[PDB]
Amino acid sequence: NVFQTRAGCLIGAEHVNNSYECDIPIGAGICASYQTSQSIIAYTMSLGVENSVAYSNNSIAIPTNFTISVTTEILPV
Amino acid sequence: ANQFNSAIGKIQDSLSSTASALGKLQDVVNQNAQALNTLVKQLSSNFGAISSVLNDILSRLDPPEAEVQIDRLITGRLQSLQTYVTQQLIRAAEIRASANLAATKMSECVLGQSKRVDFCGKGYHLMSFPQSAPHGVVFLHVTYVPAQEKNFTTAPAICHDGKAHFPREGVFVSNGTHWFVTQRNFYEPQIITTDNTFVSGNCDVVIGIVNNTVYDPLQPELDSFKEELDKYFKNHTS
Amino acid sequence: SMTKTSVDCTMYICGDSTECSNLLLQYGSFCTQLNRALTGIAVEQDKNTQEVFAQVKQIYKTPPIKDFGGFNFSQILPDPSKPSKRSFIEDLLFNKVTDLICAQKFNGLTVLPPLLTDEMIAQYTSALLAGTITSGWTFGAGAALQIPFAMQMAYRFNGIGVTQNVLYENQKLIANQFNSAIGKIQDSLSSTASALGKLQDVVNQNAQALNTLVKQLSSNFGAISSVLNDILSRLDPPEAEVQIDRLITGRLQSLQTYVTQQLIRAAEIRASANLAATKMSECVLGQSKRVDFCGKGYHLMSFPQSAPHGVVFLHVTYV
């Protein structure tokens, strides 16, 4: 469990090549998360699910359905 | 009705199960709590002197040696209190900045309708519900978001008599056979008419224009009544 | 964002001194308040990148077959042939913004690396560029909706009061005006390197603050000598505690002055980050009708660009 990066030597964590959504940040693009017989793993942060929208001259997408979403924002005063 | 009532019910389930959503307000109380605790703990430090109790310094050391030792705590506790005031002035600029940002959301999102993008929250803003919170305010934002979509075939213009026709409101769509005019935010198929489009330019100045037949709502009404005019004057000549 | 710095009270004031370490315990928790203040700054500086650079949670890409209607986006779009993802405009943005770091780390000043690296910043920018070119204003307020780019400017003109018939007739004229305007950006950034001085001043204020913080250690502050080995190895233990106390009091005020100065600059960088984050949603993601907000003229579309310790906005307006 010895791994080095730009943030320095990190002991007690396993290196994973896959990229998921983590919790405990580290730095220099390397993060940390508790995942599966479970331990702490360190891996490069994931940038989100890749969605490639098709583009064409005559192609257009008009939504046929809608939804009503309610969000909560807490601003201190 | 089922979309709004179910969304409000999820608020009670989110606030009860997750207590960290209000952490924005808990950080204000915890910040002032750590500032008051540290400010008191500085009273027990000697500050390079013999003792931290000024009553013991006066009751033991001589008057000439006491004024030097007592001055060490007075100077130290003064700098420790200036540090507290300095932190409070800095934290005041943070809480007043969030208050000015909240005062703007009360006017634009709640009182009126704000067309700003992602100011009232993600999606197209509709109506905002203010709520009371300790040392703060909670905002409930009702927004309009699309759900499902379908790929359509569009055209920049419709060519009929040789003059280009452009949509007044909405965009052109097609299922592969008929060309319809629908809104961008919602799909409402409508027959292309002279009332929904306007004539500008010609067909040669538009790149990608397609040929179609623009239905004139005045055409069949006048023609059917024109046949009443032809048959009437037919009796005039008979 | 600004450079993340961390300063320890023990090594900065008096290092390798056991007697001075006990004298520091007499002044209480002052280390805790100075360490948590500098730590809180490094956390808020990372939050500025999450509220500005990070906007949409989905990664958008450009189609292989590109017909934009005469526009050339190769300047704003990143170059896949390079080992790191960046565009032609971001080439001049990074090169015109200016070891000193290693020398400051020798005196006990720790420079923490940022959580969000430079490679991920350009990906967030490329995701917002590829989305605006394709999905237009749809992906910001909801699910991504594919729309022809020629139909996108038609709605952007109808929002400012211009009938879309102007676009189809002037499409050849607008193609030359836009491509020539983007070409002036590369000529302005290469010839004039002072347009980015707003970001260079942020680095200069940090360089002057870190260097002056170290230069205060060479001053004696009214004591016998600034070197710890000079006082401890000469004067008696009762006499040395008085002279070292003069070094502690002086170096503590110089350290509290730096922390107080950085907390003030931390409030200034968050004010500009909130102003930049507001332009991300209104000018870039959507279309803002505000006057002199997205820039002079009637706003149409905004193209964000990655920059070191900042962000560059490219606004397209109707004049």
The experimental technique behind this entry is cryo-EM
Instruction: Look up residue C78 and give its two tokens.
Output: 């990143």
Q: Which residues of A touch B28 (CB under 8 A)?
A: 76
CA–CA–CA angle B89, B95, B99 (5° rounding): 135
Residue A53, min C-alpha distance to chain B (Å) = 11
- Cβ-contact B218, B194 below 8 angstroms: yes
| Residue type, position B177, single letter | T
Which residue of B lies nearest to C56 if distances are taken between CA atoms? B122
- Cβ-contact C247, C235 below 8 angstroms: no
Beta strands in chain C (DSSP E): 4-7, 109-112, 298-307, 310-318
Helix, strand or coil, per DSSP, at residue A43: strand
Q: Which residues of B touch C260 (CB under 8 A)?
A: 86
What CA–CA distance (Å, rounded) separates B209 from B156? 6
Secondary structure of chain C: what % helix, strand, coil (to 5)? 60, 10, 35
What CA–CA distance (Å, rounded) separates B199 from A51? 39
What CA–CA distance (Å, rounded) separates A34 from A22? 8
Q: Which residues of A touch C131 (CB under 8 A)?
A: 53
Q: What is Dmax (Cα atoms) for chain A? A: 55
Residue B173, Cα to own-chain centre: how many angstroms? 30
Instruction: Look up residue A59 and give its two tokens.
Output: 């192609």
Residue B140, Cα to own-chain centre: how many angstroms? 11
The residues near B48 (Cβ < 8 Å, ≥ 6 apart) are B72, B76, C23, C26, C27, C245
At how many Å resolution was this determined? 3.6
What CA–CA distance (Å, rounded) separates A76 from B96? 9
H or E element at residue C150:
helix C149-159
Q: How many CB atoms within 10 Å of residue C135?
A: 24
What CA–CA distance (Å, rounded) separates C201 from C269? 12
Subunits next to B (3 or more Cβ pairs <8 Å) are A, C
| Strand B210-211 to B158-159 pairing | parallel
What CA–CA distance (Å, rounded) separates B16 from B39? 35
- Cβ-contact A34, A23 below 8 angstroms: yes
| Residue type, position B180, single letter | F
Q: Is the torsion defined by CA of C173, C176, C182, C186 positive or negative?
A: negative
Which residue of A lies nearest to B187 if distances are taken between CA atoms? A64
Instruction: Look up residue C147 and give its two tokens.
Output: 């729309």
Instruction: Look up residue C36 and give its two tokens.
Output: 């948590």
- Find the radius of gyration of the CA atoms of chain B: 38
| Strand A2-5 to A8-11 pairing | antiparallel
Mark yes or no for CB contact C115/A50 under 8 Å. no
- Cβ-contact A57, C67 below 8 angstroms: yes
Subunits next to C (3 or more Cβ pairs <8 Å) are A, B
Q: Which residues pair with A35 in a beta bridge?
A: A39
Half-sphere exposure of B184 toward its Cβ, with a 13 Å CA cutoff?
Answer: 21
What CA–CA distance (Å, rounded) separates B149 from B141? 24
- Cβ-contact B206, B164 below 8 angstroms: yes
Among C26, C171, C256, select the one facing B47 at the smallest CB separation.
C26
- The residue behind tokens 């070094």 is C247
Q: Which of C61, C50, C59, C45 is nearest to C2 (CA)?
A: C45
Distances (CA, A) of B227 to B216, B219, C145, C294: 17, 12, 48, 59
Helix, strand or coil, per DSSP, at residue A37: coil
What CA–CA distance (Å, rounded) separates C206 from C228? 28
What CA–CA distance (Å, rounded) separates C115 from C117? 6
CA–CA–CA angle B149, B152, B155 (5° rounding): 140
What CA–CA distance (Å, rounded) separates C285 from A49? 19
Residue B67, min C-alpha distance to chain A (Å) = 46
Q: Is C309 left (phi over 0), alpha (psi -120 to 50) or beta?
A: left
Mark yes or no for CB contact A29/C59 under 8 Å. no
The residues near B109 (Cβ < 8 Å, ≥ 6 apart) are B119, B120, B125, B128, B139, B141
- Cβ-contact C171, B207 below 8 angstroms: yes
